[PDB]
Structure 1
């Protein structure tokens, strides 16, 4: 659940590799890549 490559979008999480700026956080992905999805912490 919340915290995946797909569901990541389900939470409107942003797509950012390496890390994610801003007071945001999630620890998700984007797609097949180990992208770093960020969402409202």
Structure 2
């Protein structure tokens, strides 16, 4: 459960697509933590 707030990564719903790499999870099972390349 990482907020990804320090990394500045954006959270994505369901799962992280290819444009964004899923580092783990935004915080809840509703969305996932994603980061722009």
Which TM class, normalised by the smaller chain length? 0.3 to 0.5
Q: Deviation digits for residues 1-41 of structure 1, max 9, x if unmatched?
A: xxxx3352221111112212452213321223263211134
More helix by share: 1
Answer whether contact 1:16 1:35 (CA < 8 A) is retained.
Answer: yes
Number of aligned residues: 37
The gaps in structure 1 that reach 5 residues or longer are none
Matched, 1:39 2:16: no
The gaps in structure 2 that reach 5 residues or longer are none
Runs of 4+ aligned residues of structure 1 deviating over 4 Å after TM superposition are none
Name the TM-score, length of structure 2 as normaliser: 0.45
CA RMSD of aligned residues (A): 2.5
